[PDB]
Amino acid sequence: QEDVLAKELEDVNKWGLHVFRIAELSGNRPLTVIMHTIFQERDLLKTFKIPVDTLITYLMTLEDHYHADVAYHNNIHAADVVQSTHVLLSTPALEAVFTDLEILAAIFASAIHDVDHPGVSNQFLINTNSELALMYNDSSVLENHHLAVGFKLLQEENCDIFQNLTKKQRQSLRKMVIDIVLATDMSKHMNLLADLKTMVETKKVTSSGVLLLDNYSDRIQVLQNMVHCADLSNPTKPLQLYRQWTDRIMEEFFRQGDRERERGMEISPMCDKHNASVEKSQVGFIDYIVHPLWETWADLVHPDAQDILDTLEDNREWYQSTIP
């Protein structure tokens, strides 16, 4: 089984990695083994003098603080977003554009971006007067929490994977990670996409043909949108993966709706298992959210993402065909 897992991890650079099979073959440690593989691939342990035992200890502790009993927002989703961000970071249009610290920040942000997610939305936490919403004043409630847990865990025994960064490096990384994870709040999607559209319409490329990003605001915006694209990448994956992600988000949505109904609250969009259309909801999700975002990303890195966009469009056609 060890050799089987290593064979599967040879695909870590490919869109459509069989992340559910890696979860099984790793003994439910997909986030740990995919993060470890990616860190080795990018030589991040040597670059940042990260002891391997500290990396594994932190990763296993982080993975533990994802909920194994939530259908979607669990360690498999975290591993998927990490691996998807890793592929997007390798896109030719971005070659040599980001520093090693920015690459570290984007991968680390992906790894922590949903940690300790309870399987219900920000609006549900606000409307039920949850402790989380009281702590965070109704503002990016989950995403502030994911950050606080992700950084707090660095303080557990032999968990500080950043122990050999300089003070300046730690300060820069912390700021970038916060900026990235807060941008995964779905209520910021329209603003993030509008800014990405503006960058595409004003795009500049260097002599080497890669994207020209010469200030913090443009650089962090690309990293924010990259991780957001990875977070919203399920419909761009091979259909057998996409359908499993749909099965899982619908389970989480329906269980939230059952709690809303039981509390006499209005049921959230797509959360009423008695009056839901899974297929129509996926087509609308693609048409109004995912394809607008990915089409814009694909324009930013053209032609690098053409195959990802082609898969998304095929999957949209397939879900549509199950309606008629």
Added chain:
Amino acid sequence: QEDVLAKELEDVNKWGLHVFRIAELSGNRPLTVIMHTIFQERDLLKTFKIPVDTLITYLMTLEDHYHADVAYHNNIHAADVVQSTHVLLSTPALEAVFTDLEILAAIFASAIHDVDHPGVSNQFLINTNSELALMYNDSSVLENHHLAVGFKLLQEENCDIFQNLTKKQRQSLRKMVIDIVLATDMSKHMNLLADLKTMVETKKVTSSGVLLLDNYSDRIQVLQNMVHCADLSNPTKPLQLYRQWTDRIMEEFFRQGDRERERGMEISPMCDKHNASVEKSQVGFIDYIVHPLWETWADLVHPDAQDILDTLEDNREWYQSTIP
């Protein structure tokens, strides 16, 4: 004692209330007795069906969570900002601008806006890796905490002063209080001032000169700048009040700078007792922060802020004359 306490309270509608005497005469409960008086003056207990005993129970609990060993950011400051906001809300140029719930939100926000303040700045909390900065991801660290404490205390026994507001009133009040207290973060001063300046250049008024604010984004901005003005009202008060506030903030600054020196951190501006000029600092504070703000405010409510502005310029003249 209670009879002279009552005579001092007769000036709750005047700039330059003797708040320090009121703190002494009330047994160190200036926030409780000033809030109570203002709620009666504005008829808020009748308007919102707030039981008196619940108002007092909450106010004393809130007052208890201000620290008695911090020289400035204690319950006397909170009482002063409450009273200052109460007077600003009575500006003639604002006579019909704000609803009763908006008035309620600005006053409640003032009362809680520094609760549980540790006597050190956000930057200190960030650069020392404090628990607060870890919880709040280095963003408006103090102000998020003041809000979380202020609202959490409403859940103590007989502390829910909003129990009789409709569910929608409570939702709207919560949103406005959060928007106001978050804007008291000093790092946002220039942005707030810029928006106030834009409001002034786009100002619309009646034939009488009363402000017309149609959209929530403009109204909440005025309320944000109003509580900010009250927070920064010490140099516009009679000199013998202002001088007491200066003594207190400088004790707080010097204790923080001693902690920064000892930790080997850069010492924050105005915090090094060995190299400080209290008087030059006050004049710079007025020239670069307090007067640009209050002069912009004065223009928004022209000419009802002229006496406040005059006093500020007089106090600036006095502090400048103490520099040889």
